[PDB]
Amino acid sequence: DMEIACLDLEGVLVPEIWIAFAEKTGIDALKATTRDIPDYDVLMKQRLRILDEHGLKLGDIQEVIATLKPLEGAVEFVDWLRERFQVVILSDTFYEFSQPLMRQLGFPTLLCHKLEIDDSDRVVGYQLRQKDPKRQSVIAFKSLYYRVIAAGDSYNDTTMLSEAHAGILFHAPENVIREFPQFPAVHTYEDLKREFLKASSRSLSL
Amino acid sequence: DMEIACLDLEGVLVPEIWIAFAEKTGIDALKATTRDIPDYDVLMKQRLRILDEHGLKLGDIQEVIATLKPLEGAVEFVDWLRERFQVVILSDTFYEFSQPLMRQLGFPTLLCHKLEIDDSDRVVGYQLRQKDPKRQSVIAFKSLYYRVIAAGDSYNDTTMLSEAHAGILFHAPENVIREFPQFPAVHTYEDLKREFLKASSRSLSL
Ligand SMILES: [Mg+2]
Ligand SMILES: [Mg+2]
Ligand SMILES: [Mg+2]
Ligand SMILES: [Mg+2]
Numbered sequence: 462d463m464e465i466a467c468l469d470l471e472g473v474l475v476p477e478i479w480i481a482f483a484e485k486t487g488i489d490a491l492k493a494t495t496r497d498i499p500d501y502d503v504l505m506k507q508r509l510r511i512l513d514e515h516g517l518k519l520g521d522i523q524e525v526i527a528t529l530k531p532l533e534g535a536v537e538f539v540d541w542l543r544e545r546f547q548v549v550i551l552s553d554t555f556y557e558f559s560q561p562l563m564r565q566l567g568f569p570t571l572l573c574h575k576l577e578i579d580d581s582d583r584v585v586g587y588q589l590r591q592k593d594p595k596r597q598s599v600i601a602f603k604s605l606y607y608r609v610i611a612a613g614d615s616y617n618d619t620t621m622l623s624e625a626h627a628g629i630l631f632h633a634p635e636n637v638i639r640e641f642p643q644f645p646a647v648h649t650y651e652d653l654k655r656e657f658l659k660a661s662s663r664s665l666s667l
Numbered sequence: 668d669m670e671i672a673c674l675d676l677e678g679v680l681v682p683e684i685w686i687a688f689a690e691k692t693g694i695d696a697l698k699a700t701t702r703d704i705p706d707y708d709v710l711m712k713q714r715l716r717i718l719d720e721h722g723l724k725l726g727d728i729q730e731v732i733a734t735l736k737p738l739e740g741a742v743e744f745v746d747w748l749r750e751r752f753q754v755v756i757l758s759d760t761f762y763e764f765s766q767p768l769m770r771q772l773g774f775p776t777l778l779c780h781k782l783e784i785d786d787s788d789r790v791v792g793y794q795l796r797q798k799d800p801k802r803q804s805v806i807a808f809k810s811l812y813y814r815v816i817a818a819g820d821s822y823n824d825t826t827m828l829s830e831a832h833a834g835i836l837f838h839a840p841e842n843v844i845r846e847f848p849q850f851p852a853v854h855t856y857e858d859l860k861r862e863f864l865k866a867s868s869r870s871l872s873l
Pocket of ligand 3: 675676677678679819820821
C-alpha cells in the first residue's frame with residue numbers, strides 16, 4: 462500500500478518564514494507576532510500596511526526570503542522521503558512567501574494559502590484557502606483511498622496528525638508532546654525517517 | 668486564484684512504458700495496450716502472465732525501465748510548470764513500474780495504482796486504486812477549493828479533462844481531438860505552456 466506522506470513546512474523543513482524575513486529587514490515594526498496582536502486578520506492588515514510604508518513590494522520580499530535556506534538536513538530528508546512515498550507539503554503560510562524556499566526543495570506539491578498582489582507588485586490582501594486546511598487536505602487524500610502518514614511541529618498541525626492514519630511530532634514543544642502521546646515525538650531527521658518506516662505498512666529500508 | 672496543474676504521465680511526459688519495455692526486451696507480446704485489450708483487468712492479468720513466463724521479476728523489470736527516459740523537453744516543461752503551479756501527476760501506471768522515470772522528473776506527487784509483489788520478487792497481482800481514478804482525483808482537489816487545469820493525451824484522459832476547470836489535449840491522436848473539440852489541442856511543449864497560461868486566472872509569464 463503506497464501512502465502519501467504529508468509534511469508541515471515551517472519548523473519541519475524550513476525556518477519560520479515571516480519571523481526570519483522580518484529579522485532580515487531590520488524593521489522593528491515588522492516583528493509583531495500573534496502575541497502582540499492575537500487577532501490574525503488585524504495582524505495581517507498591519508503587516509501589509511507596514512510593508513507598504515516601507516516600500517517592500519512582493520519582489521523585494523521574495524528577494525529577502527530567497528536568502529533563507531531549508532533547515533540543515535531537510536533537503537536530503539525530502540529526497541529520501543520521495544523515494545518511498547508520494548510527498549505533499551501542507552502549510553499555513555502563503556505561496557508567495559514560500560516560493561523561494563520550495564524551489565530549494567525541488568518544488569514538491571504544496572497546499573497552502575495565497576496573497577493578493579496588485580498590478581504594482583504590492584501585497585494588498587490575503588486569502589485563506591479554507592478552514593482547517595491541513596486536516597481537510599488529509600481528508601481529500603483519504604477520499605482517493607490513500608493511507609496518509611503526517612508529520613508536524615506545532616499545535617496547529619494536530620488536527621492533521623489526528624486525521625492521518627499515523628502522525629509524528631517533529632521538534633514539537635513539550636506542551637504538545639504531553640497532550641498528544643499517540644504521536645511519536647522525535648527531533649532529528651534520522652529519527653523522523655525511522656518513524657515513517659515504522660508507520661508504513663510496507664517494508665522500506667532506511 | 669489557487670491552481671493545481673494535473674498532468675497525465677504516459678504520452679505527455681514519458682513514452683508508454685509497456686510499449687517501450689517491449690522494444691527494449693524484444694518481447695512483442697508486451698506491446699499490447701487498451702487499444703488491443705479494452706479491459707484493463709484482463710490486459711493486466713495477461714501482462715503479468717507474460718512477465719512471469721519470461722522470468723522477469725520486479726527488480727528485472729525496473730532495470731529495464733531505468734533505461735527509459737522522459738520525452739525530449741518534458742523535464743524542462745515540468746520545471747517551468749513547477750515555478751508557476753502545484754504539479755500533480757495522474758496516471759494509470761503502477762508505482763513500482765514507473766519509479767525510475769518518476770525520479771527523473773523530480774518525484775512530483777503521483778496518483779496511480781499499485782502492484783502485488785511476493786517474497787520471490789514476483790509481480791503476482793495488481794490493485795486499481797478506484798474507478799475513474801483521474802476524474803476522482805480532480806474532484807478531490809476541487810474539494811480543497813483549487814481550480815484545476817489538466818493535460819492529457821488520450822481517450823482515457825477525457826473524464827479528467829472535462830472535470831477540470833480547463834482541459835488541454837497534448838500529443839493527442841486526431842480521432843480524440845476531433846471528438847473532443849472543447850479542449851485546445853497542441854503538440855509542442857512551448858504550446859502547452861501557452862495553453863496553461865491562457866487557462867490560468869493569474870498573470871504569468873512564458
Ligand atoms: Mg510548522
Ligand atoms: Mg517549531
Ligand atoms: Mg497518456
Ligand atoms: Mg499520445
